[PDB]
Design a protein around this nucleic acid. Structure first.
Ligand SMILES: [Zn+2]
Length: 461
RNA sequence: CCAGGUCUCUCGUCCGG
RNA sequence: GCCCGGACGAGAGA
């Protein structure tokens, strides 16, 4: 990923866009009950907590492009992945405008409570104004596609979310690219049957976890994996993606029967963003707020990992690779052990920055004991060993609970945290509820006991 | 008064067969 | 009771 320029959008005939500038996160009724280090992330340059320059820090992730050509390991990667997808028999037809807008089996409607993006955002024009779920009316959208076309620029916003201390001081505030409504509709007409096929088929054929429910899928994964696990983290994954990876994506797309709309992928490469009083242009890198990013990132991840196993371990058999990705996140296995430090090595040469799983300082054997996916651990039930708990550490549930975006939500919020927490066991769970109830508002909250959630889980199988 | 993407899963409220 | 479905809200994850 890399910027190609920046300039007053006036220069290019684009409106100025008015980001909001106050966090929406305020302290919770439980802000002092529970400990934590995170706080809302920097939204502006005029933020007191800044220990460095803002706009410089947020655009820092675009680290340049290491490659542009698809070498023969990538090519074989492509060939192997596409071959797997072909087994799913993905419907390769355009999706009708109505289904693309309103949903079909496996694809949810567009989100009516979010922005319609450029230019609708400078026209004070909203999705609710354009979309009607009840009549599923396409006429107005069709008219806006005709009028404004596609390939619009993406509006940038800083993500209002909790951030650690050094990421606040460092102004490492993650960014968001609001895809235009025109472009989401277009992307969903082209790709919707692909998204649907993926959503319906989380596992090792797609190499993707999109569409899984960790409370249930965790019990599938160890079976799906080969004998020996390996994993690692990326630094700035989406932004470190070089054009060669996108080309290789297009190659998988041609290969599974989407050849005719691979031009859409080019637009995810050469993207124009409007951020406040400016405009810029990026080359490579995948815009986060776009349609299908979640699938495309998972797919590339599958290409990346295949590529490095072929580079590093000569003669490796890809038919015994079993991997599941969620965008950059991935858990992977193989019948014999593979060294992630060696994979990280080969990574360097494709612009990929790979570090040991879970911020550990050294690369170590990844085991069913230390492995994490979607931030959860894997722990066999004591009573039923074949059923696996997704175990998210209390640490992060503690961070979440200390804040609210609207105290009106306290019941839902805290109870949702309960669903994540109880997997930590009955003794940790009951201590959680003790704490919650340690303040009056906590005693107003209807919370489920361990045994109800446990039984709920067992039943769900 | 508003304002801040793409998705998945789940919970909750409410309404339905 | 069990199942299936819808609108809205929220949490987490990527
Ligand atoms: Zn340009």
């Amino acid at each position: 990923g890399e910027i190609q320029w920046m300039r007053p959008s006036k220069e290019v005939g684009y409106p100025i866009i008015n980001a909001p500038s106050k966090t929406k996160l305020e302290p919770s009724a439980f802000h002092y009950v529970f400990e934590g280090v995170k706080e809302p992330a920097v939204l502006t340059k005029n933020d007191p907590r800044l220990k460095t320059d803002f706009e410089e820090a947020i655009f820092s992730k675009y680290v340049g492009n290491k490659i542009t050509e698809v070498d023969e390991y990538m090519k074989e990667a492509v060939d192997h992945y596409a071959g797997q997808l072909m087994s799913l028999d993905i419907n390769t037809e355009q999706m009708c405008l109505e289904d693309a807008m309103y949903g079909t089996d496996g694809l949810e409607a567009l989100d009516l409570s979010t922005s319609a993006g450029y230019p609708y955002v400078a026209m004070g024009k909203k999705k609710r104004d354009i979309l009607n779920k009840q009549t599923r009316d396409t006429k107005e959208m069709q008219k806006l596609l005709d009028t404004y076309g596609i390939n619009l620029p993406l509006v940038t916003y800083v993500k209002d979310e909790l951030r650690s201390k050094t990421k606040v001081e460092q102004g490492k505030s993650r960014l968001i690219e609001a895809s235009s409504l025109n472009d989401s509709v277009a992307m969903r007409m082209a790709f919707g049957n692909l998204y649907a096929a993926f959503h319906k088929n989380p596992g090792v054929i797609t190499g993707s976890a999109v569409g899984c429910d960790p409370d249930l899928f965790w019990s599938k994964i160890p079976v799906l994996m080969e004998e020996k696990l390996f994993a690692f983290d990326y630094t700035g994954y989406d932004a470190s993606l070089s054009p060669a990876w996108f080309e290789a994506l297009k190659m998988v797309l041609e290969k599974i029967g989407f050849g005719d709309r691979v031009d859409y992928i080019d637009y995810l490469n050469h993207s124009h963003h409007l951020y406040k009083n400016k405009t810029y242009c990026v080359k490579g890198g995948m815009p986060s707020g776009c349609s299908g990013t979640s699938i495309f990132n998972s797919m590339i991840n599958n290409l990346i990992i295949r590529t490095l196993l072929l580079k590093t371990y000569k003669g490796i058999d890809l038919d015994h690779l079993k991997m599941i990705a969620y965008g950059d996140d991935v858990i992977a296995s193989y019948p014999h052990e593979v060294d992630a430090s060696l994979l990280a090595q080969s990574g360097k040469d494709y612009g990929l920055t790979m570090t040991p799983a879970d911020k550990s300082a050294t690369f170590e054997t990844v085991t069913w004991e230390n492995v994490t996916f979607l931030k959860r651990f894997f722990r066999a039930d004591e009573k039923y060993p074949f059923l696996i708990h997704p175990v998210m550490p209390m640490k992060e549930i503690h961070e979440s609970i200390r804040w609210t975006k609207d105290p009106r939500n306290t019941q839902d919020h805290v109870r949702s945290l309960c669903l994540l927490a109880w997997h930590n066991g009955e003794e940790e769970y009951n201590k959680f509820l003790a704490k919650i109830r340690s303040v009056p508002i906590g005693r107003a909250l209807d919370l489920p006991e361990y045994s109800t959630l446990y039984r709920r889980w067992l039943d769900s199988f």
